[PDB]
Ligand binder design. Structure first.
Ligand SMILES: Cc1cc2nc3c(=O)[nH]c(=O)nc-3n(C[C@H](O)[C@H](O)[C@H](O)COP(=O)(O)OP(=O)(O)OC[C@H]3O[C@@H](n4cnc5c(N)ncnc54)[C@H](O)[C@@H]3O)c2cc1C
Ligand SMILES: Cc1cc2c(c(C)c1Cl)N(Cc1nnn[nH]1)C(=O)CO2
Ligand SMILES: [Cl-]
Length: 439
């Protein structure tokens, strides 16, 4: 059984490994050069690995290797210029944590894993077009030289700007719905010396909320941090358009993030040399063309990054796609079944990711969460906070969102017209928890 995968990123490399070790003949094409071929060139991007992604790597036999290079994040460290930052633990103990991993290093581990299983990877070749009728595709290098290949099954794991998706959209209406996101983002750096000087906790995810914009920082093994600024592209107030150069960015940080600016030694340089990224939510009505082509990961469901679940979801997709392809009656049945299974969950995490921005960038909120804590301690089997369901369990995203709604409305009604917990009867709410939330 033969398969061609476009995109040696995260979902594409994992699915290549899962299929190759199950006896598939896998050819993987990547536009970029092989990152394992060391050059004289300078990437420090990292991201949050959670249970969904970790479990996928576990099935693939790669979790231990990945986690050996990951920094444990036990909770959120929220920074507001006046208050001292105190850790908000993510869960009960160190089993409920998030892992900060270098993106390039994760990709290199996955690349070795795909080749170890027997997949052939071809770099410096980007997909340009697909001829579905003749079952041929065209690739080219950066210099334009074109190369045609026959294909039997085409997997689009080629990112938020998928060329496979573009080619599919010409032979079928994919029912695309693009919801633009006003925030851009910029990557900045904190050195190991600066993070130590300012006593920045290494085993935590750091947030500098500020309403319509915010900063986060994730730790690295060498105690450096990668900082991400999230800020509106244009003003409808601060925006990227008002930050014309690095000196403008410095003044912006000194006023709005005074506690963080002194840690950003290379702010001016990083701001001018690192391009501003774009965010969006893109929903598709269908992800496949017959039994010929299918999308997964960011190619299928671009999402805003405010829940740190895009990679985790993409690796989850890879496991599911490989499972369906392995045991289906035929490729067409597999792709339809894969799409039917994962589409509702992708929509759920896309919606939860958008909702989560409000939860971070920022009364009744505190009393509700207090009661939620008591309910969790009374019925840890039934009342599980949505964040923990998304982050530390493998419950289908849509199921996690549905239970999260039941719980939010539960706490909202119980707290309504109550000044404090002393006036709330905790037994009747537990009764409602047992009534509406199975274990
Ligand atoms: C700022 C930011 C922060 C994020 N933080 C997190 C986080 O903390 N946790 C998390 O889980 N997710 C996070 N995400 C999301 C995560 O990065 C993506 O969801 C994930 O990388 C998607 O994996 P993928 O394999 O589908 O796509 P990618 O990882 O983008 O892989 C696509 C691959 O295809 C290649 N390619 C592209 N076009 C072509 C072509 N025409 N031909 C051949 N190859 C091609 C690319 O070079 C690349 O190697 C974040 C995203 C952003 C933007
Ligand atoms: C880029 C990114 C990555 C993440 C998270 C967030 C906000 C962002 Cl912006 N989150 C969600 C979260 N919510 N509250 N604390 N963490 C995580 O858990 C780690 O992955
Ligand atoms: Cl994300």
């Amino acid at each position: 059984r033969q398969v061609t995968i476009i995109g040696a990123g995260l979902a594409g490399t994992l699915v290549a490994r899962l299929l190759a070790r199950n006896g598939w003949q896998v050819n993987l094409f990547e536009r970029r050069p092989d990152p394992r071929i060391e050059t004289g060139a300078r990437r420090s991007i990292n991201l949050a690995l959670a249970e969904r992604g970790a479990h996928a790597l576990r099935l693939a036999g790669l979790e231990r290797e990945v986690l050996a290079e990951a920094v444990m994040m036990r909770g959120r460290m929220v920074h507001v210029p006046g208050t001292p930052p105190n850790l908000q633990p993510y869960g009960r103990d160190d089993s409920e944590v998030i892992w900060s991993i270098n993106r390039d290093r994760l990709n290199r581990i996955l690349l070795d894993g795909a080749e170890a299983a027997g997949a052939s990877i071809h770099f410096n070749l980007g997909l340009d077009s697909v001829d579905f009728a003749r079952q041929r595709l065209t690739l080219s290098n950066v210099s334009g030289e074109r190369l045609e290949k026959r294909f039997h099954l085409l997997i689009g794991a080629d990112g938020c700007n998928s060329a496979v998706r573009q080619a599919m959209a010409s032979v079928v209406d994919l029912g695309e719905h693009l919801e633009t996101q006003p925030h851009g983002y910029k990557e900045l750096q904190i050195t190991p010396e600066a993070s130590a000087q300012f006593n920045l906790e290494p085993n935590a995810l750091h947030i500098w909320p500020h309403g319509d914009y915010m900063c986060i920082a994730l730790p690295n093994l060498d105690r450096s941090f990668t900082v991400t600024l999230f800020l509106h592209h244009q003003s409808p107030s601060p925006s990227f358009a008002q930050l014309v150069d690095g000196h403008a960015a410095r003044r912006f940080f000194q006023r709005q993030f005074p506690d963080l600016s002194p840690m950003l030694d290379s702010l001016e340089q990083d701001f001018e040399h690192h391009p501003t990224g774009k965010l969006a939510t893109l929903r598709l009505t269908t992800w496949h063309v017959g039994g010929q082509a299918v999308l997964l990961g960011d190619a299928a469901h671009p999402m805003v990054p405010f829940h740190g679940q895009g990679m985790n979801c993409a690796l989850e997709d890879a496991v599911a796609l490989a499972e369906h392809l392995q045991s289906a009656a035929d490729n067409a049945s597999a792709l339809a079944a894969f799409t039917a299974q994962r589409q509702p969950d992708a929509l759920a995490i896309q919606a939860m990711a958008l909702e989560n921005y409000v939860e971070m960038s920022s009364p009744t909120y505190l009393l509700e969460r207090e009661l939620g804590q008591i309910m969790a301690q009374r019925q840890p089997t039934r009342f599980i906070p949505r964040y923990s369901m998304v982050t530390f369990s493998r419950l289908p995203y849509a199921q996690a969102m549905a239970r999260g709604q039941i719980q939010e409305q539960l706490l909202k009604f119980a707290v309504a017209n109550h000044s404090d917990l002393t006036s709330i009867n905790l037994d009747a709410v537990e009764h409602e928890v047992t009534r509406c939330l199975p274990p």
